[PDB]
Amino acid sequence: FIQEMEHGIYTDVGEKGSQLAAGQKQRLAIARALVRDPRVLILDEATS
Amino acid sequence: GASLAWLGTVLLLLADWVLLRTALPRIFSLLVPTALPLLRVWAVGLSRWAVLWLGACGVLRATVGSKSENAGAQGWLAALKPLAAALGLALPGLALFRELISWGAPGSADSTRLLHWGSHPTAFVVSYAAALPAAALWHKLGSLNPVRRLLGCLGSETRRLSLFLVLVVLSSLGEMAIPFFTGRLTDWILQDGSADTFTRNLTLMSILTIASAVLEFVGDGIYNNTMGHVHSHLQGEVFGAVLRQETEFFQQNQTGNIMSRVTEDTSTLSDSLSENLSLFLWYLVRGLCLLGIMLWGSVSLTMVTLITLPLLFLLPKKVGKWYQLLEVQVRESLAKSSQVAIEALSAMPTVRSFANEEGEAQKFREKLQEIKTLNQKEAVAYAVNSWTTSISCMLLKVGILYIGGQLVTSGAVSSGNLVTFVLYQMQFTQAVEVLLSIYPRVQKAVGSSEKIFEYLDRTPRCPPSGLLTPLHLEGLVQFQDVSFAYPNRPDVLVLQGLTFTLRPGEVTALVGPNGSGKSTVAALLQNLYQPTGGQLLLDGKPLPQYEHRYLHRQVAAVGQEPQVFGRSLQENIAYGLTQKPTMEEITAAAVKSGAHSFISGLPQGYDTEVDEAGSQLSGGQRQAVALARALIRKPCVLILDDATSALDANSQLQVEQLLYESPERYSRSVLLITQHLSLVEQADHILFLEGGAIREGGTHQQLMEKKGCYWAMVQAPAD
Ligand SMILES: Nc1ncnc2c1ncn2[C@@H]1O[C@H](COP(=O)(O)OP(=O)(O)OP(=O)(O)O)[C@@H](O)[C@H]1O
Ligand SMILES: [Mg+2]
């Protein structure tokens, strides 16, 4: 869904990610968490 | 037309110069005794005015007969009457005023020697030259910007600012009555043996000072109360206007920005208004008093002073726009800083969980750097404007001094009157400097109020609320070829050709992958957005035809991430009801939604104040509170937007009972957006909204038989 946006990864998401679906927000949060290559990963209702 | 009018005007001028110049003084000297020269002058002036007015009326009547030529000639002729009035009544009025001023020091030479001035060609030319500009100004005035918008706020408060002005004038009169009754200080204080003059003057001065102080006290109280009312009213109006806008206006303008505009721009505007308006009115009154004194001193030099004020006000008129733009930029930067701060302070767990306090600080510092670069220009402009005002008033004083010296050398003005005029003209120029300093502040206030007045004058891009409040509403919703594209990205269609119907007593599940458009359907059914195509009917009529509050108590929705305000749970459950419900209704709703179990266990029960973000309520409890809030209205249409995601087993059983078992199900239609197939399986209708279009529909058995998208979704985990 990122490539379907107007400007790809440079598209403004809105305040509190308002211009997004809930699943898109969860996927973006997962991507943010994974970009760090964390040693410990805590998925708190990451797939609700 | 024009030629006849010009010929008539020339004939009138010649007649006035020939006959009225000489014949009238002789006639009124023979008719009137010599003991009343003022009476002779008044009679001659009245006769001249009458003759000229009759001539002007005749010329106007003659010109009205023909209408073939332009109307400019008539416009010019319109000033013949005031010009004639000035010509006739300039001399007698001055003579009467001079006689009334003093009965022992006549200026003479006008009232007396009446024919010696009426027939005097020099005096005739002087009267014409004096009457021409006064008549021109009067005619120009009679024939008859963001600052007007700024000052329109003081509309309903005129009756109180008028009292303020009256009290200011009374205080000024009391201030000036001291020298006119007690004289100069040394006249009584220095005299040795003063018993009936020192005490009298001291008591009179003290009484006048006390009266002026009390008048100023009352006026200031009235003014401050009025300004407080203005401030409150303006803030309320701005907030209401902001809330009257459309749903996307709040996606273009962010929360902190709007909050800064509503709370901070208005406050600065009102403070500037109050300070500068009080200053302006006070200095206007005192400058008028100083002008009166100056006129008493030397009329010619006072007119010369009044001629040159526009020269002093030229430059401010040029730089006002620069001031406005500067202040607009300053307000915008402050709003951006407010947005950064609001966004950071509302998600502190997220900021700290990623160790990004430094980044938020850096963003705030960047906004503050913008504001700093603007403040540098503010300060430099302040210094330069101060220099300009000081130099302007200094040059005014110097020029008046030079002209007064020339006049005193030429013998036109006596030395004492010249000194008095100079001493009061210095104060007048100081007041002029104060007003010049006020002007940039007004320009900056315009700049500050630009955005809030844009809010106030903005036209919401949404239909107005209707008037339909039927006593009984069935709850039958109909989407007919409804299509929608979000206003920010109208080129993409989120919904394409949705056609379906919600009937009371039935449940219609809306299933599909993420981004399909289900929450968009819920938002359309709540009247948050208007469909671009098709039509959406509630009980056979469009949603905009229903009243706002009626519609929003007849259609209730539990959102995907329900919002809970910072109030007691009792106030959250009943949020928006005109009549506050009784605790029996609130507890019944909580029982229906399953929120009674945990609310009752709270130490304070339903009076438990909720945090701003609702962090006290865990996931599932907040959804139960939102469901109770939806259900307390007894709506005809009930939307559940992924409302069972966080509910535990007990609340899931409660919602299942509410949907498919409760006796009230027959009085409402439910749109059940969900992904829990347990509730979808019992749904009377199922709609697979994939990609914004309903790929399939029907009951559970039919979709399972079709082995289409629904079957694939159901058996995906089993693969
Ligand atoms: N305010 C908005 N402005 C622009 N596009 C938006 C806005 N809100 C949502 N969208 C987009 O509209 C599409 C549909 O969003 P919507 O929330 O209606 O889908 P959904 O199927 O209900 O999502 P989910 O299953 O994740 O809850 C998505 O592509 C989303 O990014
Ligand atoms: Mg959704």
Swiss-Prot record, chain A:
Family (UniProt): Belongs to the ABC transporter superfamily. ABCB family. MHC peptide exporter (TC 3.A.1.209) subfamily.
Record function comment: ABC transporter associated with antigen processing. In complex with TAP1 mediates unidirectional translocation of peptide antigens from cytosol to endoplasmic reticulum (ER) for loading onto MHC class I (MHCI) molecules. Uses the chemical energy of ATP to export peptides against the concentration gradient. During the transport cycle alternates between 'inward-facing' state with peptide binding site facing the cytosol to 'outward-facing' state with peptide binding site facing the ER lumen.
Gene: TAP2
Disease annotated for this entry: MHC class I deficiency 2: An autosomal recessive, progressive disorder characterized by chronic bacterial infections of the upper and lower respiratory tract apparent in the first or second decades of life, nasal polyps, and ulcers with granulomatous inflammation affecting the nasal cavity, upper respiratory tract, or skin. Patients may develop bronchiectasis and respiratory failure.
Protein name: Antigen peptide transporter 2
Positions spanned in the full protein: 588 to 635 of 686
Subunit and partners: Heterodimer of TAP1 and TAP2 (TAP1-TAP2). A component of the peptide loading complex (PLC), interacts via TAPBP with MHCI heterodimer; this interaction mediates peptide-MHCI assembly. Recruits TAPBP in a 1:1 stoichiometry. Interacts with classical MHCI such as HLA-A*02-B2M; this interaction is obligatory for the loading of peptide epitopes. Interacts with non-classical MHCI molecules including HLA-E-B2M and HLA-F-B2M as well as PLC component CALR before the peptide loading.
Compartment(s): Endoplasmic reticulum membrane
Domain notes from UniProt: The peptide-binding site is shared between the cytoplasmic loops of TAP1 and TAP2.
Species for this entry: Homo sapiens (Human)
Swiss-Prot record, chain B:
Disulfide bonds: none
Regions crossing the membrane: 1-20, 38-60, 77-97, 118-138, 161-181, 202-222, 273-293, 303-323, 393-413, 418-438
Induction cue: Up-regulated by IFNG. Down-regulated by IL10. (Microbial infection) Down-regulated by BCRF1/viral IL10.
Names of required cofactors: Mg(2+)
UniProt domain ABC transmembrane type-1: residue ranges: 161-444
Keyword Mitochondrion: no
Function: ABC transporter associated with antigen processing. In complex with TAP2 mediates unidirectional translocation of peptide antigens from cytosol to endoplasmic reticulum (ER) for loading onto MHC class I (MHCI) molecules. Uses the chemical energy of ATP to export peptides against the concentration gradient. During the transport cycle alternates between 'inward-facing' state with peptide binding site facing the cytosol to 'outward-facing' state with peptide binding site facing the ER lumen.
PANTHER family: ANTIGEN PEPTIDE TRANSPORTER 1, ATP-DEPENDENT PERMEASE MDL1, MITOCHONDRIAL
Name this polypeptide is given: Antigen peptide transporter 1
Native source species: Homo sapiens (Human)
Gene designation: TAP1
